[PDB]
Design a protein around this nucleic acid. Sequence first.
RNA 1: UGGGGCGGUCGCCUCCUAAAAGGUAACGGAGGCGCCCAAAGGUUCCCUCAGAAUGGUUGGAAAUCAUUCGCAGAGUGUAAAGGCACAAGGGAGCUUGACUGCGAGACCUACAAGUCGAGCAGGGACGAAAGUCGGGCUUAGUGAUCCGGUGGUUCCGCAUGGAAGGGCCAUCGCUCAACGGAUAAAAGCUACCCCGGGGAUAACAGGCUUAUCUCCCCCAAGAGUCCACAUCGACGGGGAGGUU
RNA 2: UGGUGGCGAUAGCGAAGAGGUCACACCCGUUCCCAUACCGAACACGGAAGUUAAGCUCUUCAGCGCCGAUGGUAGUCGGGGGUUUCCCCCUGUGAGAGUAGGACGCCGCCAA
Lengths: 58, 118, 74
Amino acid sequence: AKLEITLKRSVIGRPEDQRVTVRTLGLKKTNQTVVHEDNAAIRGMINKVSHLVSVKEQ
Amino acid sequence: MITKTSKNAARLKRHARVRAKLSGTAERPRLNVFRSNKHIYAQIIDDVNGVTLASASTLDKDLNVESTGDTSAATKVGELVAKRAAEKGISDVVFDRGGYLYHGRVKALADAAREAGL
Amino acid sequence: KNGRDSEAKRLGAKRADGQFVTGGSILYRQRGTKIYPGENVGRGGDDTLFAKIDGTVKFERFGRDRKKVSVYPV
RNA sequence: UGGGGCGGUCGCCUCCUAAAAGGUAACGGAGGCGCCCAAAGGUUCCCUCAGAAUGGUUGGAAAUCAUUCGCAGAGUGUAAAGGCACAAGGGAGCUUGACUGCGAGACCUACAAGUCGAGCAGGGACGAAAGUCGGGCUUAGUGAUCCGGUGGUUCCGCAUGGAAGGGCCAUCGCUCAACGGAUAAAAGCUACCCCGGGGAUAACAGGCUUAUCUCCCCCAAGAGUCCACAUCGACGGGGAGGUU
RNA sequence: UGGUGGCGAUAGCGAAGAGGUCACACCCGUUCCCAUACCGAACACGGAAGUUAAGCUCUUCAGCGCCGAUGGUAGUCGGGGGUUUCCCCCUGUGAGAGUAGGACGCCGCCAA
């Protein structure tokens, strides 16, 4: 069940852990988009950084 | 009221003290005796699981004696338990004072069990 | 006054957890005996903990409340 | 303690600050140690309280036997204790605080420099099977290098044989206490002094703070024959303003 | 019915009632043996006079004690909002405490 994750806010001014999580998710520029397969690990990652991310289930 | 204190309680505390360092848990088991007014017991304890591989008391028939304990019957049952713990006796065993000074029946059955490997 | 009049620290606590150790590996550093040697390890002169065997470290309860042997390689 | 002087202070242990791993500063709070002695410390056995707590010649009225009860007061302390209840708290044997070494590991991450408790193996020991001989939870200090002494030397010794001299292994001796220890060395006086740099002491000059300091309310005991509030004002409260 | 064990008292600690028959022991002692530190009190040693009268097995009892929820709550995690001394809002978490209760144990081995 692929789902799309979009970076909606810049990372400038954020603590290091949130930046590392966002970078590990694959996002590198604002307004980027990427697809991943839905499981508990991805949901936890989204939960950590959710104010900088918009999730949509295609 | 002077009251009265149990005899067995001191025996249990003494047994605990002697059992702290004692193991007789693996292979070579522990042999404990139970001196009593009737007679004295003798049995094997192998820990980790807990079974009596071999045992021989005095009130188990197969020849007896008037005293059935005390001093001379201590040896008279000592050699008997020794052969019992020989035909089925494997390796050696560690003697448990049990809570009674060696001097006496303990020392007696011991030397008999010394022949039975200790 | 009290000025400084203090001492140096002794970095004393735990040093291994849930992992595989070797022979002798130090496991804890205590001043009294909050931890007792439950399985095949020893205690040094100044209340240290041993291994005596290369195995896997456990931390269990002493069975008696308010006490934790909490040592069991392999 | 500097506008400026007017002082303690350095090395080591234990506790708070320290934010439930570990580490964490300030002239931030509290206490100490430069040792021991000696009872020691091995071992095998034996234990049981302790503050109170039944009765009590006479002290201890009660070393007094007997009631009753917590693993309890005690555990060289030097030092609080901080952790430790056999936390090894109370009595009985010939050893004592040996000689070779050493696997790891913890620190350090500075390899540093120094530390720390290590199983295990070999020679020979006490007490008893098992310990332990590698003293008694963590301060004494192992302050190095460097000097001198005291012993051993399978070592070298200027052509040869010696010797004088040195090496190597154990050892005993500095408040080197500003304790990682300039060289055995060391008061001042100089608005008579001189050179190089520094942003400040100058003196808010301006800057911050408003402790203060000024000024004003809120409350009202009372006073005032009388009567709170004609004139006041205890008592508290809460503010302004920029002079000091 | 002893010996020998295991788990946090839900084991405890009591209270009551039963038996003592075994047993376990009291208990007669003290020949011998250990004594005793000092002192048949233990300590051994000797049997068994009398035993259960204890003790040994029960049987109950939460009287104590023990164990212990749900449920909130304090606190806190990440995002916010304001008079930003402090407060609020959302997101998770979640104590102590009390309490409903449970609970008078079980589990062995070798005897018998």
